Design a protein around this ligand. Structure first.
Ligand SMILES: O=C(CCC(=O)Nc1ccccc1Cl)/N=N/C=c1ccc(=C/N=N/C(=O)CCC(=O)Nc2ccccc2Cl)cc1
Ligand SMILES: [K+]
Ligand SMILES: [K+]
Lengths: 189, 185
C-alpha cells in the first residue's frame, strides 16, 4: 500500500508554515507523497469576500509546484459545497484502493476528533497524524500517529492582514505566491 | 436576553490558557457568564469524568462568572455541538449563546456537523492573537486574546516527568493532579 499523507485546509493563502508541516510529516513517516487537499468554501453570508476557488488553487500550485513529492488533490475543491472528511476519504478510498492515507491534523484538533462527522467510520479509512510540539504528546482514545514539529507560528490570518495593509509577505511564503497575490490584489479586501 | 459564553473541551487538564480565553471573551463581549462545557471522551489511558469534573470545579471555584455546564456529560457517546446547543437553547430560550472557538478552528467551520442549523443556535466567537484577522463566510464575532503558550499537552508531559506546573494553572488544580497521579502515565 502506497503511504500518502493528506493535509487539508482552505490555503488562503498557502504559506511556509503549511509546507514545513507537510514536509516534516513526509520525512518523519517516510511517505511516498503528501497531497494538499484544498477545502471548498460556502458563499459569504453578509456580502463580504471569499477568495475564489481558482485563486486558491493557483496559489497552491505555485506553492507546491517545485517539490516533486507534493501534489494537489482536487476531491473537495471540485464539489459545489464543503465536504465532511469522512465523505471525502470514502471517495478517495474508492478511487485509490492501493493507497494508505495518513490524514494530518493540528495538535489542538486531536481532543475534538470525537465530534467529527462519522468519526468511527473515518478511523477505518485513514490513519490520523497529529502534530505535536517537540517533546510533547497528544491524548485521544483513538489510535493515532504523532509527529513532532516545531511551532513556526506563520498563519494565513496574519498574512491576509499584511496584504490588506499593502505590506509584502516575502520570506513568509514562496516568492511565486507573493508575486501572484500582490499582482491580483488579493486580500486588499 | 442573557448573553452567555460557552467554552467546550475535555479540560484535561484545565489551565490558565482556558481561563484567560474565557475571561477575555467575558470582558470583550460583556457576557453575563461563561459556561465551561466538558466533553465526553468515548471509550475505544483516559482521564475519568470524575477527575476532569473535579479539576474543572477546582479551576473555576474562585471566579464568579464561570460555571460548569454538564449537558454533554449527560449523554453516552460524543455530542455534536449542534446536539448540545439544540438542548441548551430549548432549556434556556432566554439565552443568547456565544460559542467560543480557537482562531485556527474558524477555517474548518464548514465541516462541522449541521453547521447551518447550528448557526441559528449560536453566535460563534473566534479568538485570535493580536494582528490576526479571522476569515469565514459565516457571521462570527472576533476577540483578540493575549498569547500565553500553555496547553494541556504540555502540562500532561510535565506531570509525567514529575515537573511542577506552578504558574500555569490554579494551585488547587495542580494539587489535585499531583495527589491523584493523573498524568503519571
Ligand atoms: O480537515 C479538518 C482539519 C484539518 C487540519 O486539522 N489541518 C491541519 C493540518 C496540520 C496542522 C494544522 C491543521 Cl489545522 N477539519 N476538521 C474539522 C473539524 C470538525 C469539528 C471540530 C469540532 N470542534 N468542536 C469544538 O467545541 C471546538 C471548540 C474549540 O475550538 N475550543 C477552543 C476555545 C478557545 C481556544 C481554543 C479552542 Cl480549540 C473541529 C474541526
Ligand atoms: K508538485
Ligand atoms: K455526549
Amino acid at each position: 500500500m502506497r503511504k500518502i499523507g493528506i493535509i487539508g485546509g482552505t490555503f488562503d493563502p498557502p504559506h511556509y508554515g503549511h509546507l514545513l508541516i507537510a514536509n516534516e510529516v513526509y520525512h518523519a513517516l517516510n511517505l511516498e507523497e503528501v497531497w494538499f487537499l484544498p477545502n471548498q468554501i460556502p458563499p459569504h453570508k453578509q456580502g463580504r469576500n471569499i477568495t475564489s476557488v481558482e485563486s486558491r488553487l493557483q496559489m497552491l500550485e505555485l506553492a507546491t509546484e517545485a517539490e516533486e513529492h507534493f501534489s494537489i488533490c482536487l476531491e473537495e475543491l471540485s464539489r459545489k459545497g464543503p465536504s465532511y472528511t469522512y465523505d471525502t476519504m470514502l471517495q478517495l478510498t474508492k478511487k485509490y484502493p492501493d493507497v494508505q492515507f495518513h490524514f494530518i491534523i493540528g495538535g489542538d484538533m486531536v481532543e475534538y476528533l470525537p465530534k467529527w462527522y462519522n468519526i468511527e467510520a473515518l478511523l477505518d479509512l485513514v490513519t490520523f497524524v497529529g502534530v505535536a510540539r517537540p517533546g510533547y504528546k497528544l491524548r485521544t482514545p483513538y489510535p493515532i500517529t504523532t509527529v513532532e514539529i516545531p511551532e513556526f507560528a506563520v498563519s494565513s490570518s496574519l498574512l491576509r492582514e499584511r496584504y490588506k495593509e499593502k505590506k509584502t509577505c516575502k520570506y513568509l511564503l514562496p516568492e511565486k505566491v507573493q508575486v501572484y497575490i500582490e499582482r491580483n490584489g488579493l486580500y486588499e479586501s
